[PDB]
């Protein structure tokens, strides 16, 4: 029972205990019988990694130089999980992923096979309604959903499980009732899982559902206070994110360019403060000199836009201040370490001005799994373009890591056309465009390299660290 299903893909199977060898062996056989390139087995139980710094360099030297496409583990309790999952963007999937992938003969979405028990929304395909939210709210809700293991879609389909709306005034509710299953919910559906770390059930679940009688702001505030307000009963899974002094001796200034729904600002404030940091909100009317002189411990600025005048004045007054966005905070929470922004990813800085339009950058992608799908869509978004689920003639670019798969074959053939030519280029073109703030040429040789799986440093997300 053989096939080409896993051609050119490298796997790392982590065995957490001696009793798992039978299953490790099973899984390896299925990978090898279905044409995996490399398949390493590493016994966690059989090597003392205590007092070894299991960081990115250590991982690339132990398990590289070629990229690991998938880690196969039914536990996240290994000391290089954060490096693998949050930095290198390698999916971590259960043994069941291999079994199900062989039976259905396609590369399955990885999210639902994550063994991270924080990934409470792993089974969710969620569309965030842009007509309900400002830009900053949209980014935040996307960050949290991704952090809870869910999938973001830019379209409503039969496969969409949840539509996020602010209120019953969102045009989309009416516009989809005309056309026509999936659930409308308030953003407190996402936030409750983040804060409490358990499935949302009972009366509180009902309070997160769209209610067409919530006709004023007052009724929304009241549901927000019932679902994520002063609970006083504890959060579950208290050891998943054990560093409760993560932001100790740090004080964040919050840009007025964020402009959150007030109860969302309370949630964000409460997040920073429960990790022992401090928050001062800046307003457009503030005299910035006296704010920063009145609270001289302020060491961090949180803003949406890199071109904000507040940020320009702030940098003038406070030249060594940390300059990050809301995504940066949650990345620090993911890593469980305060991390300067220069050691984080491009997407953790306040966003650059719009570089491209849709007409110049409507992109499809292929062979990007899990967090790499998230990362590529965020990057294309902040560049000013659109990213699509499928490859059509509407697409201006196909983004690819390698030469395998059917989308690459079709798109590479379409590149030979004379007039309306789709371009095939690698993900490093997106990253360098953003990093340099320039429309680089995708046909430069460095961006026509499609053998990026030979080096783990060419993983999407590593440009700019």
């Amino acid at each position: 029972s053989t096939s080409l299903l896993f051609e050119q893909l490298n796997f790392l199977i982590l065995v957490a205990a001696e009793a798992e060898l039978p299953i490790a062996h099973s899984t390896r056989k299925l990978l090898m019988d279905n044409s995996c390139n490399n398949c390493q087995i590493y016994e966690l139980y059989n090597e003392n990694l205590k007092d070894v710094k299991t960081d990115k360099d250590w991982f690339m030297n132990k398990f590289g130089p070629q990229t690991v496409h998938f880690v196969i583990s039914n536990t996240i309790n290994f000391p290089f999980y954060k490096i693998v999952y949050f930095d290198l963007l390698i999916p971590v999937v259960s043994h069941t992923w291999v079994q199900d992938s062989v039976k259905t003969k396609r590369h399955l979405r990885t999210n639902m096979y994550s063994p991270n028990p924080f990934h409470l929304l792993r089974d969710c395909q969620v569309y965030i309604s842009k007509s309900s939210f400002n830009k900053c709210e949209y980014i935040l809700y996307s960050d949290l959903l991704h952090l809870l293991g869910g999938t973001l879609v830019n379209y409503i389909s039969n496969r969409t499980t949840h539509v996020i709306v602010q209120s019953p005034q969102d045009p989309i509710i009416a516009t989809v009732s005309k056309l026509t299953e999936w659930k409308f919910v308030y953003p407190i559906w996402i936030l409750y899982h983040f804060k409490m770390a358990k499935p949302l059930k009972g009366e509180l679940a009902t309070l997160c559902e769209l209610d067409m009688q919530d006709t004023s702001e007052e009724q929304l505030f009241a549901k927000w206070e019932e679902v994520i307000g002063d609970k006083q009963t504890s959060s579950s899974q208290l050891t998943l994110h054990p560093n409760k002094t993560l932001f100790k001796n740090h004080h964040f200034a919050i840009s007025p360019d964020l402009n959150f729904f007030t109860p969302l600002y309370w949630f964000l404030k409460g997040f920073i403060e429960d990790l022992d940091g401090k928050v001062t909100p800046l307003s457009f009317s503030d005299d910035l000199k006296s704010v920063y002189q009145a609270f001289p411990d302020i060491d961090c600025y949180i803003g949406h836009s890199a071109n904000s005048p507040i940020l320009e004045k702030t940098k003038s007054i406070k030249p060594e201040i940390h300059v990050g966005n809301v995504s940066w905070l949650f990345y620090m929470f993911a890593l469980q370490k305060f991390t300067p922004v220069s050691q984080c990813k491009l997407i953790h800085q306040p966003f650059h001005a719009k570089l491209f339009t849709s007409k110049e950058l409507t992109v499809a992608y292929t062979n990007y799994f899990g967090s790499q799908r998230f990362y590529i869509q965020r990057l294309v978004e902040i560049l000013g373009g659109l990213s699509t689920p499928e490859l059509t003639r509407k697409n201006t670019h196909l983004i690819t890591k390698s030469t395998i798969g059917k989308k690459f074959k079709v798109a590479k053939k379409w590149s030979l056309d004379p007039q309306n030519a789709i371009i095939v280029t690698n993900h490093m073109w997106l990253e360098q465009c953003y990093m340099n703030n320039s429309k680089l040429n995708p046909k430069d040789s460095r961006f026509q390299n499609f053998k990026l799986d030979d080096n783990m440093g060419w993983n999407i997300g590593q440009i700019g660290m």
Binding site: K135, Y138, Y155, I156, S157, I172, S305, T357, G384
Partner: peptide, 16 residues
């Protein structure tokens, strides 16, 4: 197979 696909807003991420 989609149901609804919103029109893309070119300046959503920069609108004041």
């Amino acid at each position: 197979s989609i149901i609804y696909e919103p029109e893309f807003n070119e300046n959503y991420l920069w609108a004041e």
